[PDB]
Amino acid sequence: DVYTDHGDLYNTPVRMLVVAGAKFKEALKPWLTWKAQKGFYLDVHYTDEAEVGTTNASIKAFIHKKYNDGLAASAAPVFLALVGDTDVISGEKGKKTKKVTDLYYSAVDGDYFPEMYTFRMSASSPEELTNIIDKVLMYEKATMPDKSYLEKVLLIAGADYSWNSQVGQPTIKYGMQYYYNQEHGYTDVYNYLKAPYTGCYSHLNTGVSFANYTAHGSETAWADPLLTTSQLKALTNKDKYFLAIGNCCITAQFDYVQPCFGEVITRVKEKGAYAYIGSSPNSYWGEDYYWSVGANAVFGVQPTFEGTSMGSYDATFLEDSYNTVNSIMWAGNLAATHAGNIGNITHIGAHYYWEAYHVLGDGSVMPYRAMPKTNTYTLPASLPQNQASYSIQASAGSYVAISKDGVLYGTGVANASGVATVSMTKQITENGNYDVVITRSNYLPVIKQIQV
Numbered sequence: 001d002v003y004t005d006h007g008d009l010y011n012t013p014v015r016m017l018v019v020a021g022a023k024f025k026e027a028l029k030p031w032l033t034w035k036a037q038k039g040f041y042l043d044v045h046y047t048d049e050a051e052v053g054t055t056n057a058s059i060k061a062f063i064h065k066k067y068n069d070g071l072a073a074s075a076a077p078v079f080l081a082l083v084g085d086t087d088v089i090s091g092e093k094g095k096k097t098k099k100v101t102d103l104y105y106s107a108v109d110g111d112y113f114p115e116m117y118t119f120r121m122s123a124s125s126p127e128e129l130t131n132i133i134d135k136v137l138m139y140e141k142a143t144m145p146d147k148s149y150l151e152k153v154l155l156i157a158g159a160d161y162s163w164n165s166q167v168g169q170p171t172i173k174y175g176m177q178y179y180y181n182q183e184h185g186y187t188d189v190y191n192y193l194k195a196p197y198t199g200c201y202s203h204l205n206t207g208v209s210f211a212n213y214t215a216h217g218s219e220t221a222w223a224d225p226l227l228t229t230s231q232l233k234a235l236t237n238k239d240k241y242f243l244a245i246g247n248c249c250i251t252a253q254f255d256y257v258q259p260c261f262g263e264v265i266t267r268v269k270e271k272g273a274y275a276y277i278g279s280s281p282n283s284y285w286g287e288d289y290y291w292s293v294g295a296n297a298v299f300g301v302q303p304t305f306e307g308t309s310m311g312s313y314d315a316t317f318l319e320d321s322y323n324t325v326n327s328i329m330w331a332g333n334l335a336a337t338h339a340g341n342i343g344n345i346t347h348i349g350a351h352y353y354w355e356a357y358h359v360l361g362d363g364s365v366m367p368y369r370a371m372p373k374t375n376t377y378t379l380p381a382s383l384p385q386n387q388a389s390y391s392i393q394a395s396a397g398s399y400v401a402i403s404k405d406g407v408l409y410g411t412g413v414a415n416a417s418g419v420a421t422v423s424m425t426k427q428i429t430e431n432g433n434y435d436v437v438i439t440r441s442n443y444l445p446v447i448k449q450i451q452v
């Protein structure tokens with residue numbers, strides 16, 4: 001079925017194509033340096049290059065050729081990072097949504113589904129891009145001073161006199177029943193099922209790892225309980241950055257005359273989110289219900305895990321797969337698509353949802369699920385020069401990367417017996433301190449060095 005044929009795009013070695021506005025060259029460097037250190041093979045291009053350009057058609061042609069060439073060489077990009085607002089990378093109007101979308105950068109030349117996990121670091125200045133990057137680096141390197149906020153979430157079924165009880169509450173209650181609960185490590189599941197909502201957004205300030213709102217939205221607000229872009233700019237969650245998901249209308253409409261909610265929540269300095277998932281056009285109650293919970297969910301009936309297909313919540317908590325921000329969105333879209341395929345009540349085509357939902361901020365982040373675990377490994381005392389590979393001990397499934405000065409030299413995934421064969425695409429031929437990074441979904445990163 002669609003889940004088998006069009007599942008999680010994540011693969012190793014991780015490869016990322018980056019297309020960035022030329023103004024961002026300096027500000028982007030620390031993000032690129034870290035992505036290389038953690039094992040991403042990067043192909044980085046700026047819109048001031050003739051082969052890229054600043055116009056939709058050239059950027060799209062450039063990306064599609066990179067993807068096709070990569071695939072032919074058994075090295076397809078996994079991620080596509082768009083760096084800039086619509087003044088430098090425009091997107092285009094959805095065929096179904098009639099609103100801006102980045103989908104066609106990733107759907108190569110004739111395909112329904114994206115070929116790459118695409119996200120947009122939308123910034124109007126280098127300073128704003130730095131704001132996003134610094135939050136991402138704190139989160140991914142786990143350098144936050146107090147990790148207790150990771151064990152807390154905020155879940156809101158927002159106001160609608162009729163739909164809140166029919167769909168909003170069932171959505172949030174499903175998430176809490178199966179995942180966002182004490183038995184998964186969450187000490188504080190702040191949840192608002194209906195009015196009174198007073199106090200709900202103060203939890204963004206005191207600290208949560210995740211905020212999910214489902215009900216009405218506008219380009220610059222979660223409508224009720226109200227959270228506007230003005231309020232975002234006044235948040236105080238220093239060192240406590242979250243993933244936010246707005247299952248509502250138009251909060252990710254990133255070509256609006258004013259910065260949209262999704263842009264502001266990621267752009268704000270030392271507060272707000274490291275990433276946002278939301279919709280560029282309108283969203284709808286049925287389709288968002290399926291997106292979060294899975295297909296077969298019914299209005300006014302509490303859905304079960306056994307009675308629904310895989311939705312975004314379900315995918316998030318699979319340990320093995322769907323471990324990136326982009327993959328959470330993908331899972332949601334798949335569920336809405338499946339719901340249509342098997343004949344659930346839908347009044348819009350699945351094409352619309354793939355055009356609608358976007359990641360703003362860094363979609364390549366692997367979110368923690370409550371408190372992340374401590375990894376186990378052994379660091380060798382030295383690396384002999386001129387080797388095609390090294391054997392590095394790390395827990396099964398861990399991804400090990402060897403680098404120096406932001407140049408990635410080799411990567412490998414630890415097998416079931418706790419040994420990674422790190423394939424050296426660039427061999428070590430000079431003395432120096434080499435960086436070794438080991439990452440794994442819901443584990444604290446290991447960031448060390450080995451002297452050669």
Ligand SMILES: *CC(=O)[C@H](CCCCN)NS(=O)(=O)c1ccc(C)cc1
Nearest residue numbers: 215216217247248249283284285288
């Ligand atoms: C516009 C909006 O935010 C809501 C979101 C509902 C889904 C919440 N998960 N859309 S709507 O269904 O209320 C809607 C209202 C009017 C029009 C013209 C389109 C959609």
Ligand SMILES: [K+]
Nearest residue numbers: 160161162163
């Ligand atoms: K309504």
Ligand code: NA
Nearest residue numbers: 293294308309
């Ligand atoms: Na489900």
Ligand code: NA
Nearest residue numbers: 316318321322
């Ligand atoms: Na997962």
Ligand SMILES: [Pb+2]
Nearest residue numbers: 085254255259
């Ligand atoms: Pb914008």
